């Protein structure tokens, strides 16, 4: 059962593409292992966690409310919007929008939330404020997923995303209540079944967010651990492959299996 770093390198061969990986201790923030930690990859839909982080920060500051109802129109709908397409009459609350964005990767929910903060530049400013000067969101959904080879728009580094996620979930950046909401949303993710969750034994906790884009781009951010408690952050990205979605999923799942089978080390 291959060691995780061996499996990641194997995944590059199998996919014919770059794979970026890091594993952090949740408590200490220590890097346990990594592969291409400081190379850039398209973040794709994984940005939506950071977006709801920025929204929760505004909520903590009294500039936004979880219950605020947003009405929108047919003309706001973009592709892959399974929740928002059903609420044209009644709208959705900020809370419901983050839930749809994170748990169903609803692209329209994401754009509605971007509007609440003033656009992708404001998400990038929020990130710079909390010390992440690498991760950048430049575009709205779904154009942000274009993944033009070697283009830096809408990218992160595995190390930057992992540390930013840690800061959101466990630091003082958000209130206790907001931190918990953010991890509850990621825990409730319904859209990443074929990725790390496919390798996970019963009794484990995982809170995650997937992403897919053009040029074979695929990835996941996660906080996971045994015994109902997260203990590590895992970040996996790949871009460039011509392999099918199923093939890309299976390589990520296999990286997951490796890190599970060697966890006790």
CATH number for the domain that contains residue 48: 3.40.710.10
State yes or no: is 45 an active-site residue: yes
Two structure tokens written together for 264: 């006790």
**Of 30, 27, 22, 20, residue with least CA distance to 230:** 27
> What is the spatial distance between Cα 235 and Cα 159, in angstroms, rounded to a whole number?
8
Task: Tell me which residue range forms the domain holding 114.
Answer: 1-265
Please report, in range form, the residues annotated as the binding site.
209-211
> What is the spatial distance between Cα 152 and Cα 168, in angstroms, rounded to a whole number?
23
Helical pair 4-15 and 245-261, crossing angle rounded to 10 deg: 170
> What is the spatial distance between Cα 25 and Cα 239, in angstroms, rounded to a whole number?
25
From the centroid of its chain, how far is CA 149?
20
From the centroid of its chain, how far is CA 119?
18
**Rg for the chain (alpha carbons), in Å?**
17
Report the phi/psi class of residue 229: left, alpha or beta, with left for phi > 0 and alpha for psi in -120 to 50.
Answer: beta
The structure was resolved to a resolution in Å of: 1.7
**Of 204, 207, 148, 164, residue with least CA distance to 183:** 207
> What is the spatial distance between Cα 26 and Cα 169, in angstroms, rounded to a whole number?
9
Domain count along the chain: 1
Please report, in range form, the residues annotated as the binding site for substrate.
209-211
Q: Which residues of 125-160 are buried (b: 16+ CB within 10 A; e: fewer)?
A: ebbeebebebbbbbebbbebbbbeeeeeebbbbbbb
Two structure tokens written together for 233: 């952050």
> Looking at residue 85, what DSSP letter applies?
G
> Could you give the 3-state DSSP secondary structure of residue 159?
helix
Q: Which of 12, 28, 99, 143 is catalytic?
A: 143
State yes or no: is 143 an active-site residue: yes
Q: Which of 45, 178, 217, 258 is catalytic?
A: 45
Burial class of residue 89 (count of CB atoms within 10 Å of its CB; 0-12, 13-18, 19+): exposed
In total, the chain counts a number of residues equal to 265
| Location of structure tokens 């220590």 | 30
């Amino acid at each position: 059962h291959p060691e995780t770093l061996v499996k990641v390198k194997d995944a590059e061969d199998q996919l014919g593409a770059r794979v970026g990986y890091i594993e952090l201790d949740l408590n200490s923030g220590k890097i346990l292992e990594s592969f291409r930690p400081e190379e850039r990859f398209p973040m794709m839909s994984t940005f939506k966690v950071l977006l709801c982080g920025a929204v929760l920060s505004r909520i903590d500051a009294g500039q936004e409310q979880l219950g605020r109802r947003i009405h929108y129109s047919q003309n706001d709908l973009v592709e892959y919007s399974p929740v928002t397409e059903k609420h044209l009459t009644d709208g959705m609350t900020v809370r419901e929008l983050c839930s749809a964005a994170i748990t169903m990767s609803d692209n329209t929910a994401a754009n509605l939330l971007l509007t609440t903060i003033g656009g992708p530049k404001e998400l990038t400013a929020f990130l710079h404020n909390m010390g992440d000067h690498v991760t950048r969101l430049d575009r709205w959904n779904p154009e942000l997923n274009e993944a033009i080879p070697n283009d830096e728009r809408d990218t992160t580094m595995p190390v930057a995303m992992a540390t930013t996620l840690r800061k959101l979930l466990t630091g003082e950046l958000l209130t206790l209540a907001s931190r918990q909401q953010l991890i509850d949303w990621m825990e409730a993710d319904k859209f990443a079944g074929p990725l790390l969750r496919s390798a996970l034994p019963a009794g484990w906790f995982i809170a995650d967010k997937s992403g897919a884009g053009e040029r074979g781009s695929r990835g996941i951010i996660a906080a996971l651990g045994p015994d109902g408690k997260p203990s590590r952050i895992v970040v996996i990205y790949t871009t460039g492959s011509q392999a099918t979605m199923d093939e890309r999923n299976r390589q990520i799942a296999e990286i997951g299996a490796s890190l599970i089978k060697h966890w006790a080390a």
